Design a protein around this ligand. Structure first.
Ligand code: CYC
Length: 179
């Protein structure tokens, strides 16, 4: 007789082929999502003519890392850098989860009210001006951030509004698609 391979090793291999098809699609989806986020920060940097645009991801214990960045070559890269909770306190992570935004024309202007240690931190990256909008899943997932490094910058309301609208679509992706 015969047919022993059909319901043994050939059907085993067939399940493995179907799972391989599915795992390669899932990895391509991870690549495509990171490409869309990368294209978004690079295009926002070009369109704003900002010196840096990045996506900062916070973990539940409030530590963080830059997951996407576009930076002009005259200024430091935040891509590889991990930071503790103290650079962005959990009390403020909660205010961002509840929709806090900031548009700071001049981080060195005392009336902007920034912690001395925070002014020192943003100085590490040659930051003069910063625009900050949250990405949520509400729990904070991260920040979409624009920096000016060459000069102080009076941010315009539409820049803040449309940065928020981009971050809100990142929030939907990270939530409704469960991506
Ligand atoms: C003190 C030793 C440390 C510290 C304290 C601190 N930070 C904030 C608030 C913020 N910190 C950040 C962090 C960033 N901004 C960026 O552009 C980047 C990427 C380069 C990061 C990581 C942000 C966005 C905020 C929120 C600012 C806001 O007012 O909404 C506070 C609270 C606010 C205040 O100014 O008192 C505090 C106390 N931050 C440091 O970096 C020090 C090491």
């Amino acid at each position: 007789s015969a047919g022993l391979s059909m319901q043994a090793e050939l059907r085993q291999q067939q399940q493995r082929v179907e799972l391989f098809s599915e795992v390669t699609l899932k990895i391509r989806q991870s690549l495509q999502l990171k490409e869309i986020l990368h294209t978004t920060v690079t295009e926002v940097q070009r369109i704003l003519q900002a010196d840096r645009v990045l996506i900062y991801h916070v973990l539940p214990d409030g530590t963080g890392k830059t997951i996407s960045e576009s930076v002009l070559p005259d200024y430091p890269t935040l891509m590889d850098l991990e930071f503790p909770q103290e650079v962005f306190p959990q009390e403020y992570q909660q205010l961002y989860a509840q929709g806090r935004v900031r548009a700071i024309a001049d981080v060195h202007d005392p009336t902007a009210g920034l912690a001395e240690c925070l002014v020192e931190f943003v100085d590490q990256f040659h930051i003069k001006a910063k625009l900050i909008v949250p990405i949520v899943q509400n729990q904070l997932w991260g920040l979409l951030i624009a920096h000016q490094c060459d000069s102080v910058r009076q941010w315009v309301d539409f820049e803040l509004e449309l940065m928020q609208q981009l971050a809100d679509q990142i929030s939907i992706a990270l939530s409704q698609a469960q991506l």
